[PDB]
């Protein structure tokens, strides 16, 4: 059984977010609220309807009326972007229920350009008869990027594996792209390039044997 919970939502900084929890089988059961941020384990932020845990700012407050409970977040800052979960204990049926979670995103975050680092194949990898080019892309916002590879000036049509962007702890994103070559392909071109496009601007880094 999954408690009902507010649809995921976007709140402008300084405004108030209200995340609600409800369900027939919630009733008067005291509600706990958990915060889940990237890179971190879940943490208890509000317990027993309205008690702030240590580390929980006065901006966070909990209420409960009828079979609805609400987590109210005042004076929202970008650090509050996270998934929030409600939870109760049913002592009749002896079950823990969780809510399905609510994603809070904070608007107005300025665009951040990716840092791009390209490494060539290592000498050791070439000795093992393989060749991997590694293009690392970090601290970009919003989390959407295009990655293209060039062999000399020709678009590479094969051998590319690229991650989907992953939110990091500062709420910017990271991604990685790997180009797999034979040593012979690596040595027979003058250069290879990783091209990274983000919000219509492009950075191209190039390495050569």
């Amino acid at each position: 059984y999954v408690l009902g919970q507010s649809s995921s939502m976007s709140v402008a900084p300084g405004q108030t977010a209200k995340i609600s929890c409800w369900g027939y089988y919630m009733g008067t059961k005291p509600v706990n609220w958990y915060q889940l941020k990237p890179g971190r384990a879940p943490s208890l932020i509000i317990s027993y309807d309205d008690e702030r845990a240590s580390g929980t700012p006065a901006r966070f407050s909990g209420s409960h009326s009828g079979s609805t409970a609400t987590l109210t977040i005042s004076n929202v800052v970008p650090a509050d972007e996270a998934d929030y979960f409600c939870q109760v204990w049913d002592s009749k049926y002896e079950e823990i229920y969780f809510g399905g979670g609510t994603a809070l995103t904070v608007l107005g975050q300025p665009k951040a350009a990716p840092s791009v680092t390209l490494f060539p194949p290592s000498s050791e990898e070439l000795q093992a008869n393989k060749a991997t080019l590694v293009c690392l892309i970090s601290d970009f916002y919003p989390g959407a990027v295009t990655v293209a590879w060039k062999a000399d000036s020709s678009p590479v049509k094969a051998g590319v594996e690229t991650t989907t962007p992953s939110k990091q702890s500062n709420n910017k994103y990271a991604a990685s792209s790997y180009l797999s070559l034979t040593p012979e392909q690596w040595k027979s071109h003058r250069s290879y390039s990783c091209q990274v496009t983000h919000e219509g601007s492009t950075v191209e880094k190039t390495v050569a044997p």
Partner: protein
């Protein structure tokens, strides 16, 4: 508080999942301790919790195949999940809980472990090949350089990756793994360091792939 949870990394379909939680910084006999799993979609599901004197609560949809126990002499709690199915793939968290009994009975998940990632698959574990990413100052700020380790073709997740045995933490970024059409993962860990330290300071990436019991200490030289 819980230490990092111990698990197999991968469990075959219909096999048995066995997890162990170890309490640090105190006894495991002073609280209820529980298991909550975090799905790939990011939702939370309670499995069970117990107190060392014998009181156990198990999720009824899992009762036919869950076992939970404690060993107070080892300060440990174990979870066994039999006949695993694909939907058992998740990050399993060990949690020290709060509990109250007034006119109302109440629990809370107070201190969560980092979680043990469980993949359900018939593929066998593969340990990583590690290669040095020799330092370069092309992309870094003045007086710094980026160097790293390429951790190639392992299965399942995760690999843990430290630098100089944990002595070096500043400027470390271990990237999320790419999952390849081969079913194998690769990742890179890079550290941004002063250029002037390339001569004086040696840099070793400490790669640990617990599911395959493979460790590599790779020296990264210019």
């Amino acid at each position: 508080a819980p230490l990092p949870e111990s698990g197999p990394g991968v469990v075959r379909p219909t096999g048995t999942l066995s997890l162990t939680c170890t309490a640090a910084y105190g006894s495991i006999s002073r609280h209820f301790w529980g298991w909550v799993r975090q799905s790939p979609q990011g939702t939370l599901e309670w499995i069970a919790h117990m107190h060392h004197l014998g009181v156990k609560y198990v999720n009824p949809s899992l009762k036919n195949r869950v076992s939970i126990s404690m060993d107070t002499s080892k300060n440990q709690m174990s979870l066994t999940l039999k006949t695993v199915t694909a939907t058992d793939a998740a990050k399993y968290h060990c949690v020290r809980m709060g509990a109250r009994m007034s006119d109302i009975a109440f629990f809370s998940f107070g201190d969560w472990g980092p979680g043990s990632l469980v993949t359900v698959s018939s593929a066998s574990t593969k340990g990583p090949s590690v290669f040095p990413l020799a330092p370069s100052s092309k992309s870094t700020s003045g007086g710094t350089a980026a160097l790293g380790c390429l951790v190639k073709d392992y299965f399942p997740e995760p690999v843990t990756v430290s630098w100089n045995s944990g002595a070096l933490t500043s400027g470390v970024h271990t990237f999320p793994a790419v999952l390849q059409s081969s079913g194998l993962y690769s990742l890179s860990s890079v550290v941004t360091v002063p250029s002037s330290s390339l001569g004086t300071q040696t840099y070793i990436c400490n790669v640990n792939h617990k599911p395959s019991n493979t460790k590599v200490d790779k020296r990264v030289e210019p």
